[PDB]
Amino acid sequence: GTFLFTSESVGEGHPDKICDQISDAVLDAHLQQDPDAKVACETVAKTGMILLAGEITSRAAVDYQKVVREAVKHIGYDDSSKGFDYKTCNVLVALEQQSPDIAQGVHLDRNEEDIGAGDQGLMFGYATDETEECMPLTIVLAHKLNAKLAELRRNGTLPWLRPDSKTQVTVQYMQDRGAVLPIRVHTIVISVQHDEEVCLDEMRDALKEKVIKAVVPAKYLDEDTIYHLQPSGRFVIGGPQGDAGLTGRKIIVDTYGGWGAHGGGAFSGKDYTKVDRSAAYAARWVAKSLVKGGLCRRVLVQVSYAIGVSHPLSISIFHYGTSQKSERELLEIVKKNFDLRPGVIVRDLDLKKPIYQRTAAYGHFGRDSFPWEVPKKLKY
Amino acid sequence: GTFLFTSESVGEGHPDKICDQISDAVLDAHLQQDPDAKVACETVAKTGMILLAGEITSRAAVDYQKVVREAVKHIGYDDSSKGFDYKTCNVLVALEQQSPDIAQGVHLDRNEEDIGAGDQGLMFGYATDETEECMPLTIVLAHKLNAKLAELRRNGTLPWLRPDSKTQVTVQYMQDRGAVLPIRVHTIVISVQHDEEVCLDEMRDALKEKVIKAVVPAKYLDEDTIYHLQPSGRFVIGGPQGDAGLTGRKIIVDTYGGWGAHGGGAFSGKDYTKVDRSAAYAARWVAKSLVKGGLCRRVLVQVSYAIGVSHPLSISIFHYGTSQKSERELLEIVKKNFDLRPGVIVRDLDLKKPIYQRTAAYGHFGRDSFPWEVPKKLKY
Ligand SMILES: C[S@@+](CC[C@H](N)C(=O)[O-])C[C@H]1O[C@@H](n2cnc3c(N)ncnc32)[C@H](O)[C@@H]1O
Ligand SMILES: C[S@@+](CC[C@H](N)C(=O)[O-])C[C@H]1O[C@@H](n2cnc3c(N)ncnc32)[C@H](O)[C@@H]1O
Ligand SMILES: Cc1cc(=O)n2nc(-c3ccccc3)c(-c3ccccc3)c2[nH]1
Ligand SMILES: Cc1cc(=O)n2nc(-c3ccccc3)c(-c3ccccc3)c2[nH]1
Ligand SMILES: [Cl-]
Ligand SMILES: [Cl-]
């Protein structure tokens, strides 16, 4: 009755994640001056280059050079020896206004609560009682391994570390009436960019003793656990120099690590009218509210929209057999307790607030008591 | 016992899809000259611009200007009046060699069958008996609606159409012992870029009569079906001018439309050593082989890899309760019948062949009898 499941995460200096963080730094900079900014900011990263491309209509006056370079500085790319330097990279901007055709169909001359969805699309929310924060253990552990690397880099105890990292965790689970119960960690992968002087053995020993053991409870690690630590053997070239980055290329890291489902939309760089983000956050909030409210142990919520239409076109609930109530009954509870129009989600989840850069590494869910992580008390 | 499920698709001129097609045109151009080319080609599109960014190590001599412009011509963006013109757009190139650190850890001095995975990651394959091609009806219909638009554009019967389109289909399903049975179409969305002269009523009438009715069987359409046709009211600005495009931003359209699961990796622009593509294709092949072999009605397969390691780190099977055999037994059948090392997948699925641009619109799965769509006869 057991099975394996694998999830991955990446660090703050992973090139795709750099782009997500820059896109959300730009969004936050606009929102600080104009809470109603319309933002659709993609970031592209390659050796020596950050390019911003997309559509922004905003009353803000934003210094893109400063916003980009400060985000890169925070990540830790501050010297040519590391492969990338915020002080001296190229920042290119190809930003236009939002299409007037979109604007007129979505939000122009519309009451805020009745704004249309900014696009069509589908979105999912997921929650699992296997951890207190209602997230899959595989992805929680993967994120925490990347966060530990950044901590040990920033505090100087492993000064050979660089910002670009990836981790991957495979857990053996037991089925339990539709819920899932973690048993043990089967395999861990860690790859992290490093300086030219440190040797493989020093790195592998540190990754096991100072990273894995500082993150993963010993009860999950045993004589059979497989470790792939610096499996490529050499990772000196990294960041955008090693691999181009783009916004919205870590959408599974951003969400549930392969569990649940995904509708395809990226989060970073987008204001609340883009339901790819706001409705996914709302669907997480619904799912977590159902689990924390004791109605389910595990649940998947789908919603979908049409551009220009406020109310979702469809709402669906799948409880994996982990509720006494039928999925039909849960759907009625959701419809009674939640209003998933984007112009209402924005009020419930406070989505004009410039907190987005904080969401753009280590997953958008399961951390920090963001509004979508605070369950709603359900009436039924 | 019924539920709704929604999937979307996009057309050939959708800006993200333009990028996927260009990335795969570049891959094919390299493979035509060098079957062992190492390609990681991202494309970015905005008003007037195609940018190629990434890493290519290849013996080919490729004229990027010609390859990009011919791909855009094929899509149909051939005039400033349409918002984009292959003849006169900017093509910018920021392509470097593959990182030598990656190369040495993945493929340098390695027997081809024993090449390492080109990255870590997780990948899923899915199949459902609800259609002959073993794909979800929601996404099949969504793709076919986009293909119908392109057909009517290219044959001149709706000459106001432009290449950028999106569609979305919501189907009401019945559960059936873990399998799913489509009942009816609940809602259809179509948005398509159009010329300045055609009016909304002419467009909505054509979309219903000449597009939907030519694609969706009447048995699925009834008095309750909801139609959102040109719901934004105006879509003259389109293509990259309306919305930036990037490679790998339609990964759910490329796969299963929200059904099954996704590991996060993009397909387009990548040679066979990038398991994001090859192992997802192999996992589809496994899933479809299990369904066509009569072992399951519906199945999800996960695999995962570490950079530099040939064999998958994990393999998992979930049959939704649609097999008499346990998931454990199915996993043993898979392990006996398939070798999911990338250096073996390449031989089984013929992944050096330059057929990739054909995969880059209308989904990678369920069409055209590609090798991953031809089931393997299973021995057990
Ligand atoms: C392996 S690269 C993707 C393939 C790459 N584009 C190529 O040209 O082969 C994906 C990610 O792996 C990590 N990476 C880069 N160089 C690496 C190395 N030498 N060893 C291990 N991981 C590496 C970085 O996080 C990078 O963003
Ligand atoms: C709605 S746009 C995403 C939001 C956009 N970036 C913005 O600035 O608001 C996403 C896709 O919708 C389609 N689209 C563009 N303009 C549209 C319009 N006026 N009406 C409907 N769909 C449109 C195109 O396929 C485009 O790639
Ligand atoms: C026995 C059993 C009970 C169960 O409820 N589930 N759910 C999922 C699942 C579904 C979608 C996304 C991620 C996980 C799976 C599964 C396990 C291994 C590989 C693939 C899927 C599963 N396997
Ligand atoms: C009753 C029933 C039986 C069943 O086997 N499934 N599977 C899925 C599913 C799981 C992952 C991805 C896509 C679909 C769902 C479902 C339905 C509506 C919304 C969300 C999920 C479902 N609902
Ligand atoms: Cl990556
Ligand atoms: Cl889109």
How many Å separate Cα A223 from the centre of its chain? 33
Q: Are strands B161-176 and B2-10 parallel, antiparallel or unpaired?
A: antiparallel
Q: How far is CA B202 from CA A202, A371, B25, B145, in A?
A: 70, 44, 36, 18
The CA-CA-CA angle for residues A71, A216, B340, to 5°, reads 85
- Whether residue A320 has its Cβ less than 6 Å from ligand 3: yes
For B63, half-sphere exposure in the C-beta direction (CA atoms, 13 angstrom radius) is: 6
Which helix (H) or strand (E) segment holds residue B3: the answer is strand B2-10
Name the experimental technique.
X-ray
* DSSP E strand boundaries for chain A: 2-10, 38-46, 49-57, 78-79, 84-85, 90-96, 121-128, 161-176, 179-194, 226-229, 245-246, 298-305, 314-318
- CA-CA distance, A76 to B163, in Å (whole number)? 42
Ligand 2 atom closest to residue B236's alpha carbon, by position in its atom list: 19
Q: What are phi and psi of A287, to 5 degrees?
A: -60, -45
Q: Do B250 and A237 touch (CB under 8 A)?
A: no
Cβ <8 Å between A307 and B191: yes
Any chain A CB within 8 A of the CB of B313? yes
User: Could you tell me the fold of the domain covering A113-136+275-379?
Assistant: GMP Synthetase; Chain A, domain 3 (3.30.300)
Query: Long-range contacts for B294-297 (Cβ within 8 Å, ≥24 apart)?
Result: B295/B323, B295/B325, B295/B330, B295/B333, B295/B378, B296/B127, B296/B320, B296/B322, B296/B323, B296/B330, B297/B128, B297/B129, B297/B177, B297/B178, B297/B179, B297/B322, B297/B323
What residues does CATH 3.30.300.10 cover in chain A?
1-9+137-237, 10-112+238-274, 113-136+275-379
CB pair distance less than 8 Å for B186 and A7: no
Q: How far apart are CA B351 and CA B274, in angstroms?
A: 11
Element (H, E) at A141: helix A137-154
Strand partners, B10: B166
Cβ proximity of A97 and A253 under 8 Å: no
Number of residues written out for chain B: 380
Residues A364 and A355: their CA atoms lie apart, in Å, by: 11
Do residues A197 and A181 lie in contact, with contact meaning Cβ atoms separated by under 8 Å? no
- Residue whose tokens read 């995969």: B359
Which residues does B208 contact at the CB level (< 8 Å), separation at least 6? B227, B229
Given a contact cutoff of 8 angstroms between Cβ atoms, the answer to whether A5 and B207 are in contact is no
> What is A1-9+137-237's CATH topology?
GMP Synthetase; Chain A, domain 3 (3.30.300)
DSSP state of A210: I
Q: Whose CA is closest to B285, among B329, B342, B338?
A: B338
CATH architecture group of domain B10-112+238-274: 2-Layer Sandwich (3.30)
Which ligand 2 atom minimizes the distance to the CA of A102?
Answer: 19
Place of tokens 């105006």: B234
Among residues B82, B148, B186, B270, which one is catalytic?
B270
Residue B318 beta carbon below 6 angstroms from any ligand 3 atom: yes
Tell me if B1 sits within 8 A of B27, measured CB to CB: no
Residue with tokens 């080109």: B118
Query: A81 CB less than 6 Å from ligand 3?
Result: no
| B-proximal residues of A, 213-272, CB under 8 Å | 226, 228, 231-238, 241-244, 246-253, 258-259, 261-264, 266
AA letter at B101: D
Give B198-247 as a DSSP string: --HHHHHHHIIIIIIHHHS-GGG--TT-EEEESTTS---S-GGGTS-EET
Give the pair of three-digit tokens for residue A364. 């958008």
